[model samples]
Target: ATLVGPHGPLASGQLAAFHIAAPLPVTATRWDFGDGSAEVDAAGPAASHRYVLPGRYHVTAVLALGAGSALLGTDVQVEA
Candidate 1:
């Protein structure tokens, strides 16, 4: 699975509109911004998030695939 931001191949909080890329039928999705911030029950494949801090953070995506699950993420840099 993958979470792509507006400014991707990388992203910033300033351009956080997001979309997902995955290899399975996802029953659920979530985004972890890696600053004690997360978005849950995501609308799947397409969503957005924000942050107030700047620098590189380990962003993660949690996906639900019925009995199977997939996890994918990247270290994203957010701007002030």
Candidate 2:
């Protein structure tokens, strides 16, 4: 499982887009923005988010598959 997104510092309140790096088939994908926000449930692999404050966050992705589940994540740096 691989999560693909920005690797550099981002401005606060900017929209950030992310998605699975590989073509792994999955039933559903859920995202945690790591800012005490609600989880986003997506039918596919692609998702988007925005940061409101300046801080470091651990963005996580939960993928549901036919056999089992997969975990993927990436770190995001947001600047004020």
Number of the top TM-score candidate: 2
Candidate 2 residues 1-80, lDDT tens each? 77777434577777788876454777678888867675878666777767778877778887776566667778888888
State model 1's lDDT: 0.62
Cα lDDT computed for each candidate against the true fold: 0.62, 0.74
Identify the candidate with maximal lDDT.
2
List runs of model 1 lying over 4 Å from the truth.
8-15
TM-score of each: 0.65, 0.77
Query: Clash pairs of candidate 1?
Result: none
lDDT tens digits by residue: candidate 1, 26-60: 65777677565665456655556565566776666
Deviating ranges (above 4 Å) for candidate 2: 6-9
Pairs of colliding residues, candidate 2: none
For candidate 2, what is the TM-score? 0.77
